[PDB]
Amino acid sequence: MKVELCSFSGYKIYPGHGRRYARTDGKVFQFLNAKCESAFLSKRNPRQINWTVLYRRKHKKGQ
């Protein structure tokens, strides 16, 4: 089965978890939990949020 990646955070979404959001102009997103869901619907940038995958990739944390 195909696992999804979260549209805000970037974590793997396992088949029983999360929600999907289909906008009026297409562009189906998927969300791990209501925290990332509210962060997407409040129009917030994942690159400025510390625990998202995109912030780690931008700031080169880890490795």
Binding site: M1, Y11, Y14, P15, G16, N33, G62
Partner: protein, 394 residues
Amino acid sequence: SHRKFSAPRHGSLGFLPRKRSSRHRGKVKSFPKDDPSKPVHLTAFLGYKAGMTHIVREVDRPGSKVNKKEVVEAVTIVETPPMVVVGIVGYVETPRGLRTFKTVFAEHISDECKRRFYKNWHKSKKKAFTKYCKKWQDDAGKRQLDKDFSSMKKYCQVIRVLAHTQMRLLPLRQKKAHLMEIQVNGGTVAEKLDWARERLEQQVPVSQVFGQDEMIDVIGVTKGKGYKGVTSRWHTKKLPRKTHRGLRKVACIGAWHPARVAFSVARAGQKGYHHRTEINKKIYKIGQGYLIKDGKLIKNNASTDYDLSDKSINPLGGFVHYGEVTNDFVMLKGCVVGTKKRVLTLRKSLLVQTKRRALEKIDLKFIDTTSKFGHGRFQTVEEKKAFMGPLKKD
């Protein structure tokens, strides 16, 4: 005058004495009907509710929209350690009913089962069956025991066996075992007794009782909710906001000229702790307990034929408010009655099961082991470590 608009009755009058249950362990009110054609087997078992999780599985039902599509289904895990047989009881059929005839216990009874006979094990001298256990080691007791078994062969029609749980293999606080009569169903009474005689002082696992994809019944006590109002107890209509003497009430409890209150009128009382029997729950998986071989342990219970992992049925951080499941477990489709750590009775079905839903073959593709203590997002700690990387605590 008549009721202006018709409406169905709130609640059921078939579960009418909604009281606290007089028993904690679920009771088999009716065993399956015995026929001599089938071989000798057991009809019931006893497990403990651990928790619930997901299955992704492949569905084979021709004609549906979900034919050959993966689904996500809730399942309930019940931990079922093997039970110890410690006695046989016989029954005779009387015109007043089914009278018990003779009970014979085994020579050695564990302290788990001996705890059941006391309200205070700490103050007791643990004297139970001490003068009884000298009947298995003298000739005048052995001859009496053989005459007792022969009398049961001659006169009994219903044979039930006494089995108790093993509480030291469980993460529970309780050490006092649960005893239960299981009706032995099979051939004649003579070979039915000569089956239980050899299984005296022996362990019966869940595999001898239940098979894979069996539709069984779950008997148990509902989780208690205390003294509840009629709005929560019977799901009646809430009165409007302008109501003076409270709105979570039944407005009319009866007419005038029937000058009593009827027994069918929804009224406040105890909600929960009711003894229920829920039929037709499918066994998705009979898992295997933890076992050590060649030094290392085999704990890959939740691994499927498609997953190919090394994880157990236990989620991350363990099952919430239960503990760790290290024994055999039964995976039932959907929810079962009761709270966690509750003893439940698993019974074979009373009905013949001729249906594609009841005879469907289940293969598991994925068992979800994310943490139930919050929104868990990792199946295993090795996957979590491989995603997170090193932390400060290392």
